[PDB]
Symmetry: D2
Subunit: 297 residues, 4 copies
């Protein structure tokens, strides 16, 4: 029951702190390139071990051998004036170094791709690894939907555990709120598109004010790693291949409700969406693919 977290930056550390505050790890491996930092981060985590429950750090990937779950957070320092594409591609070449050394020592692990753009990069992981579809997952929209549910529940006077809606598509501006599935404790609403804009926007102001997301995406990967490790068979909107749904014909990844357990994705839901909804998801994949098409793997 070993877990590896590649990249000990703000995301990885917040991922790893959330994985530690959850019983989930027997072993925890942290990986990056600045040795002085890897050690300092593992030593800070194990100075407070009495309050946690679990730690390794280093540069060589043999440390990761036989990880049950490998969370990938490593990204690239984004330049200003750089385009979305040159950004993606630098993160594709970084993956051209990571995923080989992950499969190399853990051919059976579950891959969880957190780094961005997560949809495109979960496709790169699938292609570089050759792993089946079940063992390649992306953080996707799990946080998006969670934030969506919370804000709507706050507009109503109810607890978020009793409000149920989700956001599918690209994890980004072209995501899609599925308003036909909104529910309150067994009651369909038909018995709010602004909240959705607040989420994708709020997610943009953060990256602008602070550079990245760390705390929120760390909790969400905690929500996800919990279902996989402990095999809860829980449902999360996460990036898997949807070629063959909503008319799409390319090998596009994006978030659709999946059931997560020991083996990764146990099945992919095939949603029956409204006309409009099915169109927006098709446009969402048109957006992703209009960029995925131009990457050199």
């Amino acid at each position: 029951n070993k877990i590896t977290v590649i990249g000990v930056g703000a995301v990885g550390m917040a991922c790893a702190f959330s994985i530690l505050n959850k019983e989930l790890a027997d072993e925890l491996v942290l990986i990056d390139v600045v040795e002085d930092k890897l050690k300092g981060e593992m030593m800070d985590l194990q100075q407070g071990s009495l309050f946690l429950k679990t730690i390794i750090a280093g540069k060589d990937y043999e440390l990761t051998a036989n990880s049950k779950l490998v969370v990938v957070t490593a990204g690239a320092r984004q330049q200003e004036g750089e385009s979305r594409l040159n950004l993606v591609q630098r993160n594709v070449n970084i993956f051209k170094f990571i995923i080989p050394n992950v499969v190399k020592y853990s051919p059976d692990c579950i891959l969880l791709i957190v780094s961005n753009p997560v949809d495109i990069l979960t496709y790169v992981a699938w292609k570089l690894s050759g792993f089946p579809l079940n063992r390649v997952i992306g953080s996707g929209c799990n946080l998006d939907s969670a934030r969506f549910r919370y804000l709507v529940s706050e507009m109503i006077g109810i607890h978020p555990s009793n409000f149920h809606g989700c956001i599918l598509g690209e994890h980004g501006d072209s995501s899609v709120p599925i308003l036909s599935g909104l529910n309150i404790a067994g009651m369909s609403i038909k018995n709010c598109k602004d909240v959705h804009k607040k989420v994708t926007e709020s997610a943009y102001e953060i990256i602008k004010l602070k550079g990245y997301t760390s705390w929120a995406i760390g909790l969400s990967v905690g929500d996800l790693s919990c279902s996989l490790i402990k095999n809860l068979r829980k449902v999360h909107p996460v990036s898997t291949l949807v070629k063959g749904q909503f008319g799409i014909d390319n090998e596009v990844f994006l978030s659709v409700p999946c059931v997560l357990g020991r083996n990764g994705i146990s099945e992919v839901f095939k949603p029956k969406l409204t006309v409009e909804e099915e169109q927006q998801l098709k446009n969402s994949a048109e957006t992703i693919w209009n960029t995925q098409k131009d990457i050199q793997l």
Copy 2:
């Protein structure tokens, strides 16, 4: 943060033991008529370390300034005499003994609740989930109406995390538990723990529980059945009020089946 459970039957204790494991009570109080049993206080008081409630008191006026009262026997004007509070009726039939609880107390409707179909909805949800092959927290659906064989499933709002006979297996399986035992202790204590949490910690969660429903679904008399209610610090805060006709008339049939006018107030 005082809590009272009246009736140390097998239920009132399952309710007690479940309200103590959820660590809700600063002061739990057990009242009943036979004392030599009551003085059950000393057992709970002996695994105290394994619990998280400093005070456990039993006897036969000790319920003063309580914020929640669970009735399980087996009463009220003496609860209100010292606990004028939220009273949650667990005794059966819950739909009817909650009409009595509110008339005999004069409390508003927010402070008079019944267990109702909170347990029935929980069990129903599990089985559908154990059937699809997904964790029960991600499948959502409620059964409303009477706590009994007339309850109604709401197929118009089944949901798997924002999406779109098993019933009779839940009401039938409740019978076998009465026959094979007589009383139902462990399961109702959980559902009462689940409810007591939202009430005490003001979670404002939605539970199908018994309160006034006249005005909904074409009912014309003061019946209390399980409607999805927003439970919190102040008892009930809002009541959700409109589904398929196939089911709304099922809700009057279940109110029709709901003995009301055959006892004296």
Copy 3:
């Protein structure tokens, strides 16, 4: 990760309900002779959603490949026939029926444990803590020996977070609970939950529980009393073996008080 509790008495169920609230079992099994009660399975099986264990099975060979066996009646060669596992004896008197459990089974000493003074030490610790005015987790002290009026306090190791009659109040208060009730259900279920946790999750925590003690404190015969034991995945892993004479002779007096040679193996 299968767990078995034999004897659906009031204890075996408090033990069951407490082992399910700590969410330890992938598969809980209840065995006993009278079936119409046994088929208590359906209540626990009805608040399933409020628990975290997919399987609850009762009957009269179903205990196969179990990792823990709690004996509470009210047996063994049939536990071992299918569960050759850790057996934790809760039946009374625990000090003696754990000698029987190990001889009749042939298990090594690590896989034969008794509740013993784990509950007695927990309650004792609370009262001293409620007396000083500090949280019970920060005061540490155990009572060893026989589960009864002969147990020994270890004043030579009382501690408040690394520092330096209440006893008789704990053993006396155990009597009143038998008289006023007959059985002790809720409190022993907690102590058995506390123990079952370390065992199942391999916490390697230290609990005063019943195992072989001949060799310690000048005892000369095969008596099992409560010694501080390191409980884990494999049952007992180490046994802590030397305190004031005032107290070590108290440990033989408690073993002296320990009926042994008056029943047939």
Copy 4:
């Protein structure tokens, strides 16, 4: 039940993340000076609210009005070649700005001083605030003792909840392991001084590799804020005034086991230590005071 955290750096954020992962806060206020960062940090925390339970950020201290607990983490960028003293003094003048504005809007709050040197600075807080002794606490040795207990428990084959020892004195190199109180589940050991050096050393390599401690000290303040807010009457080694113990005659703060609840410190233990132990604590205060004596408040 409001909690304020002054300083939204690595310590404060790790403090605040640990306060949030614990039910403890109704309101949570974050405070510093870089507006662009305060907002970005509060927006990252409230994007993952569904997984937490509670948030404010800003520069003006009126936000903090009537805080039940005010955690102070703000420190100064330590220069190289700067001496321990010029360092302390810059953190004293920073406190000359903080503590007035804390008392100004929350005259009844509990002060928890985390910034370093915590012992000296808890004395500065007491003097600047005029608050009684119970409402001025310092993180002190709570983490030190916790780490001590864990490492020793790991050398034995037991769980840390069944090993009990503590470290008192300066939170630093002159701290003192009280070996006379070591215990295992009701048994005194007399029925290891190396672990202590590993802790104070490990705490130094961290500051060198990473600049600061964040994760560990964030958990420890979580352990502390839990007892105060929820009023557990729990015992922690924390910086309070010890003038009148172990021969000390100056108004020196340092960690001695205290009972913590709604009102802060409910009582201060008066330990009965071995000869040696009582000497080291006297030397530990000699060390602290050899620096406290030279600060200008």
